[PDB]
Ligand binder design. Structure first.
Ligand SMILES: [Zn+2]
Ligand SMILES: [Zn+2]
Ligand SMILES: [Zn+2]
Ligand SMILES: [Zn+2]
Lengths: 252, 253
């Protein structure tokens, strides 16, 4: 498997889980997403330079690249942003949304028209689509990056969670969707305990995002949460001891 | 005139503050450092792709590029790592040291020989140099990056502090050294309160590095701390409320 897959479709609006490399390579596994709304496209963490040819081809078989009007970057990491020059070049109509904390860091990649970058203030923002639909950019700071956002699609009822919900797959055992949360949890525990900053940051985020109607959680790594695994993930994450909570394993 | 400057020199060992661009651009300002020990060089956060030509020429005017044996990356951010492919190609004998948290993230920049990367475990490590001198890689996690290190040079008594100690200069008002700490603090406060993760991490880090003899703190952004400003910085940082301490101000009520 691992072709482009449709997470949500109501005719006017689609949320797509883009395809994967067919064979495991020596690189951290990543997920990219495409939202289509009328005639305009939105890319979610379309990713690094090395995967760019593959992701670009996944996108191009679904939509003309000139119809990508918005590109959302959750944070600054290489698995998210390092293809930025390539995306700016091939998607001539795309605006890029990233935390204000990182807008002056992206020019380190190379030269581009910096007016195509929209800073996101800490408390979040909304992307206004031409059809009148909206995408909500919600704060998710320190999970893990100090400047970090998630994106909630209120039409699809899908939360794109970035690094939150990541899973590290066992060799040869990748899978796209979470059914049994308890058998999935072993793939998530180490990543979250080490990368996420503290229970205070996790609890704050869960309290905020739980106000939304979330049918699926789509992370930037690992497998997409469906069904009851959504609420079970939010419950587990809210109580997680992580990061500086466990500081005695990180210092001295 | 922001040319290469020597922070420490004892003949056998030098610690250099590489030069700056003459014209300011719309980009976060960065510092690069070069350690020379005998005939081998160590680069500290040599930086992104856009600044690579300038940093490379600053290094090449001081030492052979084939003498760079070690390149240290404090963390993953683009102002630190996005020149990795260029540095790997022009410093053919260099190994790259970075947190194990990022070792599998770096291949997203592009293809390179992954045997050239040395993972740094969370507790840190030492670079053993051919002379018998050492450089100490010390943990600095969550200040700001979750996988983040500083480097202490016990010969020079210089702490390369990464993003810790960063200052955001007012445009056209760059300067290389901290004289008056209380007059430098306005350039540092916003960055530290927002990017650094919590006082718990800051206090742990200050307690740890304060056991070392630190004459100068050299940050990856801003100005180098000398004299009493080093001590004032450490005490200020140890008590700083930052990051998730202020998380209720980063979310709407
Ligand atoms: Zn990340
Ligand atoms: Zn990621
Ligand atoms: Zn940084
Ligand atoms: Zn930096």
């Amino acid at each position: 498997m691992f072709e482009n897959e449709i997470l949500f479709d109501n005719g006017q609006h689609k949320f797509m889980f883009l395809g994967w490399e067919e064979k495991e390579e020596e690189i951290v596994q990543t997920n990219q997403y495409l939202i289509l709304d009328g005639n305009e496209g939105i890319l979610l963490d379309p990713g690094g330079a090395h995967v760019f040819p593959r992701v670009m081809s996944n996108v191009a078989e679904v939509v003309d690249l000139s119809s990508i009007r918005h590109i959302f970057y959750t944070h600054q990491d290489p698995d998210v942003t390092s293809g930025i020059l390539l995306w700016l070049s091939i998607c001539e109509n795309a605006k890029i949304y990233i935390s204000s904390l990182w807008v002056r860091f992206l020019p380190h990649f190379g030269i581009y028209d910096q007016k195509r970058i929209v800073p996101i203030s800490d408390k979040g923002t909304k992307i206004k689509l031409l059809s009148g639909n909206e995408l909500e950019i919600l704060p998710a700071h320190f999970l893990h990056s100090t400047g970090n956002f998630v994106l909630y699609d209120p039409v699809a009822k899908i939360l794109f969670s970035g690094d939150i919900g990541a899973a590290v797959f066992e060799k040869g055992k990748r899978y796209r969707y979470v059914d049994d949360f308890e058998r999935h949890l072993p793939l998530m525990e180490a990543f979250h305990k080490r990368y996420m900053s503290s229970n205070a940051a996790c609890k704050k985020w869960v309290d905020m995002v739980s106000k939304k109607k979330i049918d699926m959680i789509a992370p930037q790594h690992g497998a997409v949460f469906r069904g009851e695994s959504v609420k079970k993930f939010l419950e587990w994450f809210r109580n997680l001891k992580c990061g500086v909570d466990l500081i005695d394993n990180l210092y001295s």
